[PDB]
Design a protein around this ligand. Structure first.
Ligand SMILES: C[n+]1cn([C@H]2O[C@@H](COP(=O)(O)OP(=O)(O)O)[C@@H](O)[C@H]2O)c2nc(N)[nH]c(=O)c21
Ligand SMILES: Nc1nc2[nH]cnc2c(=O)[nH]1
Ligand SMILES: Nc1nc2[nH]cnc2c(=O)[nH]1
Length: 613
């Protein structure tokens, strides 16, 4: 809505910038500190800035809006030596297009989005069990035997009871049929009984592409033709499979396991055989359903047959499969032990299927340049538990990432806050820019600040949030991380997290960039200095900081002391950019003088903690 990034370019580059239409901030060794703060506070859009900054720490430079652009890998700082966020290929200096330069920034910037979420996401696994509004991306880093991952993901094209299909969606090529198969089924299995595993090149490329969940799985791969393979989590079976009893003899029942069953079996002039194998794969699983959480049965669709039968939970198309391939995969959710509570997915049963409706499935969805997004949906629908963050009641600590503020959730803001009252970590779109690739809606910052801040709940904009996590847990959030402060600052972020002792006014807390310009506007647009300060911070809706801590610091802390307040900074590894009970309550009062109604309790809640300090 206001917040910018300082687009810090290194020297060898400076001259192009000059030709832009964005402003250019110029340094110069001295400045002082409160020089930067008053300067930077001058820009309302992103800016380009260069010149010596050797003097300053990183957190200082992030608190400030800095993104690092050079042709060199990294730049010197006071703190340490930072990996350049945006490296230009020199050819693309150099050259000297102001634009293809600019476009170059944009993209890697957009790429940076994922470092931010990752930083947060990555705190959350360190602190959380439940996980709401989730997707492939979280599945990706979960330990399924710990985390429990929730959400309502968009549902892939499905056969069962049960039609609706399609409608069609746009897509993109992926890994080949059979690798892409593996890809979406392996999440939380532990033991895979892959039958008709072939020559293994499949599984082998999977291992070449997904080494973690390959190794955190024990494979029995059943097949006469299957080659010897060392891999000591890979047990090779040269048996052929007619009976379930060729799987029993390869199972530890004296110990608990999510077991997965995969049936990819076909032989060598009708193929009402092709059929019985499919059926027999199923028939085998069924009997065993009680050992396996699930099955993925191969399921060629007949020609000769018009409607027919099988045991299934689901039937669906499969990514990257040639468009003439009329072979759906069949899913079977089963009873039998598992880490993901798939109960939602109906206990795999006898399903009457209409070849034509299936045909139309393949026709719509197959194509060896069409899979990506299907595969995802398959992957999420299968492994995430279909639960709704807002409505869910949580015995265990919970994370609530980037889903609260979705446009489905409009009107349910109450429930939103109540969630950010009890979340380990969650976040909300505050950004008032006009505003693309992202489909959320914004909580008024003022409201966020006031509803959000509790003894136990810290309430910072994305950047602050980031900053904080560095400071406090430097190895969940490396200092040298790369991200976009400005993007970080479209977020409100909230953490089950005590105020520091001492309430040292660190940068994660105090940045208040542009508060000067922000105050003038206030007075020239909708009219009416520590009181003045806090009124503006709110009346503006340009900032999200944690009031409570801010309070506890302002009073219980400053003054305090020229000496014994730095000292307790030192000490608290903290840093800054800017070097009485009543004015605040007047602040408060005045504020809601302008807005009973559109707020605020609470307000009250706050006030009534000043003159009840
Ligand atoms: C109309 N139709 C075409 N095909 C495909 O089947 C091929 C014939 O050879 P195939 O051995 O039946 O392939 P399959 O193992 O996938 O079933 C080509 O005709 C492909 O287009 C079909 N394949 C199946 N399985 N079922 C169908 O109804 C069908
Ligand atoms: N910052 C950010 N990170 C993400 N990681 C995955 N999705 C997102 C997102 O929308 N924003
Ligand atoms: N199967 C699968 N699909 C994905 N789509 C995006 N990420 C993944 C992943 O890890 N596995």
């Amino acid at each position: 809505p206001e917040p910018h990034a300082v687009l810090y370019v290194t020297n060898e580059l400076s001259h192009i910038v000059k030709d832009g239409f964005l402003p250019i901030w110029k340094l110069t060794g001295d400045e002082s500190l409160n020089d930067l703060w008053l300067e930077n506070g001058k820009y309302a859009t992103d800016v380009y800035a260069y010149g010596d900054v050797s003097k300053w720490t990183i957190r200082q430079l992030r608190g400030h809006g800095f993104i690092f652009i050079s042709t060199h890998k990294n730049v010197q700082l006071a703190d340490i030596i930072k990996t350049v966020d945006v490296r230009i290929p020199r050819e693309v200096a150099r050259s000297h297009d102001m634009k293809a330069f600019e476009n170059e920034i944009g993209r890697r910037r957009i790429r940076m989005r994922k470092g931010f979420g990752d930083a947060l996401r990555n705190y959350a696994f360190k602190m959380a069990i439940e996980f709401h509004g989730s997707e492939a991306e979280t599945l990706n880093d979960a330990n399924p035997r710990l985390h429990k991952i929730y959400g309502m993901p968009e549902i892939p094209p499905l056969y069962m009871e049960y039609a609706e299909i399609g409608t069609r969606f746009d897509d993109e090529p992926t890994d080949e049929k059979l690798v892409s198969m593996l890809d979406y089924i392996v999440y939380s299995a532990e033991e895979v009984h892959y039958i008709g595993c072939g020559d293994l090149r499949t599984l082998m490329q999977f291992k070449k592409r997904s080494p973690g969940r390959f190794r955190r799985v024990l494979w029995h791969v059943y097949d006469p033709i299957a080659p010897e393979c060392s891999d000591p989590n890979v047990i090779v079976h040269n048996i052929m499979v007619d009976s379930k009893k060729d799987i029993l003899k390869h199972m530890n029942f004296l110990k608990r396991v999510e077991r997965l069953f995969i049936w990819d079996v076909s032989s060598d002039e009708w193929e009402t055989t092709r059929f019985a194998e499919d059926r027999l794969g199923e028939e085998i699983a069924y009997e065993m359903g009680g050992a396996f959480s699930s099955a993925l049965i191969k399921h060629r669709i007949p020609n000769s047959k018009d409607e027919y039968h099988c045991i299934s939970t689901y039937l669906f198309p499969q990514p990257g499969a040639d468009a003439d391939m009329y072979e759906l995969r069949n899913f079977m959710r089963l009873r039998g032990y598992s880490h993901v509570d798939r109960h939602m997915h109906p206990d795999a049963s006898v399903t009457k299927v209409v070849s034509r409706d299936v045909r139309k499935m393949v026709e719509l969805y197959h194509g060896r340049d069409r899979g990506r997004f299907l595969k995802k949906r398959l992957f999420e629908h299968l492994h995430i538990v279909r639960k709704n963050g807002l409505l869910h009641e949580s015995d265990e600590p919970r994370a609530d990432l980037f889903y609260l503020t979705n446009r489905c959730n409009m009107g349910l803001e109450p429930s939103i806050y109540e969630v950010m009252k009890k979340s380990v970590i969650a976040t909300a779109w505050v950004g008032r820019a006009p505003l693309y690739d992202y489909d959320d809606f914004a909580l008024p910052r003022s409201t966020v600040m006031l509803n959000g801040s509790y003894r136990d709940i810290r309430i910072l904009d994305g950047n602050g949030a980031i900053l904080f996590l560095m400071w406090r847990y430097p190895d969940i959030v490396k200092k040298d991380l790369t991200y976009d402060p400005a993007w970080a600052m479209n977020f409100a972020v909230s953490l089950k997290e005590p105020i520091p002792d001492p309430p040292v006014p660190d940068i994660s807390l105090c940045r208040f960039i542009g508060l000067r310009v922000e105050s003038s506007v206030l007075r020239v647009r909708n009219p009416t200095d520590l009181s003045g300060h806090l009124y503006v911070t709110l009346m503006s809706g340009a900032y999200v900081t944690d009031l409570f801590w801010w309070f506890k610091m302002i009073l219980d802390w400053s003054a305090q002391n020229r000496e014994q307040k730095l000292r307790d900074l030192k000490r608290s590894a903290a840093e800054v950019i800017e070097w009485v009970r009543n004015d605040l309550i007047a602040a408060l009062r005045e504020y809601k003088r302008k807005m009973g109604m559109r707020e605020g309790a609470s307000i009250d809640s706050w006030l009534e903690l000043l003159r009840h300090l």
